[PDB]
């Protein structure tokens, strides 16, 4: 062993509005974990691959968030802030993006999936629901490694000027 070392893992700081799908994707990339791997590591199994698609029948339970809060050092109350608050309706399929936010903070925001959200009040821009250059839909936020459209390679920060 390395003497006086504590068993450790690569951590990531969650951004102020980062979605759980985006967060788990970064944590998985930081540790080169497959989606099945993190679920086995937390012991919740295939559930992680389901959450990364925003498939929330059922929602992330107290048990499973506290389980993920054992391998991720982020506490379960902060993990619950990566999800819609109680009774806020959300949509999983059309993945959406502000772009002007992504130039400031490279994360998907869970509020971009709310059924009540359509503009960024900070930027006063209509949030995108597909790539404005090539019309390809955005991939699940767990897969936003490159920070660009997977088809035409336009960076999300440039898509800010193609909004509203």
């Amino acid at each position: 062993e390395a003497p006086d070392v504590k068993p450790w893992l690569f951590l990531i700081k969650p951004y102020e509005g980062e979605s759980l799908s985006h967060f788990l994707g970064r944590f998985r990339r930081a540790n080169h974990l497959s989606a099945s791997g993190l679920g086995t590591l937390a012991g919740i199994g295939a559930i992680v691959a389901r959450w990364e698609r925003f498939h929330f029948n059922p929602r992330p339970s107290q048990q499973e968030l506290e389980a993920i809060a054992s391998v991720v050092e982020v506490d379960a109350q902060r993990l619950a802030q990566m999800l819609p608050p109680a009774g806020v309706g959300m949509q999983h399929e059309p993945i959406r993006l502000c772009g002007a936010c992504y130039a400031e903070s490279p994360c998907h925001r869970i509020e971009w999936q709310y059924k009540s959200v359509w503009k960024c009040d900070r930027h006063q821009l209509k949030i995108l629901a597909k790539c404005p250059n090539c019309q390809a839909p955005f991939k699940m936020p767990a897969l936003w490694e490159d920070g660009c459209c997977h088809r035409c390679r336009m960076p999300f920060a440039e898509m800010a000027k193609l909004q509203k």
């Binding site: 003497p3 006086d4 450790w8 951590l11 791997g37």
Partner: protein
Amino acid sequence: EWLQAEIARLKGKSIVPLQQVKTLHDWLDGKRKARKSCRVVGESRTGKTVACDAYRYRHKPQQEAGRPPTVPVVYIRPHQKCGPKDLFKKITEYLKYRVTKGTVSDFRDRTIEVLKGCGVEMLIIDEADRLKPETFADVRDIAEDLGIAVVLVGTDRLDAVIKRDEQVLERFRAHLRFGKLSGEDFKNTVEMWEQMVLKLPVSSNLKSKEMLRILTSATEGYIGRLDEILREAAIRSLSRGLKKIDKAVLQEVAKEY
């Protein structure tokens, strides 16, 4: 009972500050400073493992909570027929990185990231002749892709294995030779063992010409045989109520070799 505590002490292991150890450590400091890959070679039981194991404590980690530890020297002994995945497991388990499952590709990528994140500068591979010939490619890539001095340790069997792959041969050709003890160095070591290791109630005077003659014949200069003979001789002496290693007890032990 006092006897049970002396046996519990004598059956154990200790590190004596031999000049051979000092010579290796100063040499490793230069190789670590230059990040040069090299090999340590010497016949069996000459103290290579103990001297290399002593070097990692001399560079013990520093860590902050929620961070990878700073670990300048990694030491691993692979198991026999170590393939690349087991190599990556040994490294990440030494650094106590928590991910123990995944493909060889994940284990490679996590290992290179862990080595970089922990700031490793020297990797010591003890009994490196246990590595499979295909896994030396990953060892070479650690030394090339990262600024890491890789140190291969083994017996002359390692010199044979390295010559079968020119790419390893031309990377690891700087070497240190571990020697057996002889002459006055052996006589000096025998008296250090009595005073630092055995610490029996009464002086055995192993330094004496006749005791030194027995030890010289039985040890052949192997430090492993010196330690194993003198500790067992002490344990036998103490168990029969002697206060010192007697001639007859040392001869009883020596005639087992």
